[PDB]
Amino acid sequence: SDPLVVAASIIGILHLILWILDRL
Amino acid sequence: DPLVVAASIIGILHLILWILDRL
Amino acid sequence: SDPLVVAASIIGILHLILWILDRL
Amino acid sequence: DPLVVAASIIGILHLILWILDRL
Numbered sequence A, C: 001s002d003p004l005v006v007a008a009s010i011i012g013i014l015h016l017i018l019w020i021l022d023r024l
Numbered sequence B, D: 001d002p003l004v005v006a007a008s009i010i011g012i013l014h015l016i017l018w019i020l021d022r023l
């Protein structure tokens, strides 16, 4: 696997979750 | 990879929800 | 990789650009 | 892939700047 792509994917999922919960 | 795919869809979805949240 | 990953990449670059500009 | 690497770097930077901007 690609460490950078894994980290960016996880960070991206976390980003949407935190943004949603912030907008609620 | 299901992670890469899921994060790809989630990334596209994130921009959509952001634009609509801003407009 | 595939057109999904490409599209999400382009869309992620676009997202940061538009967020920075919307934030200025 | 260059585009994927750049988007990975940009995605990480995006979250960091968003969190900070929000605080």
Ligand SMILES: N[C@H]1CCC2(CC1)[C@H]1C[C@@H]3C[C@@H](C[C@H]2C3)C1
Pocket (backbone or CB within 6 Å): A005, A008, A009, A011, A012, A013, A015, B004, B007, B008, B011, B014, C005, C008, C009, C011, C012, D004, D007, D008, D011
């Ligand atoms: N919000 C971003 C959009 C771009 C990606 C990170 C999250 C996403 C997951 C991986 C694979 C591509 C490029 C980045 C890494 C699509």
Ligand SMILES: [Cl-]
Pocket (backbone or CB within 6 Å): none
């Ligand atoms: Cl915002």
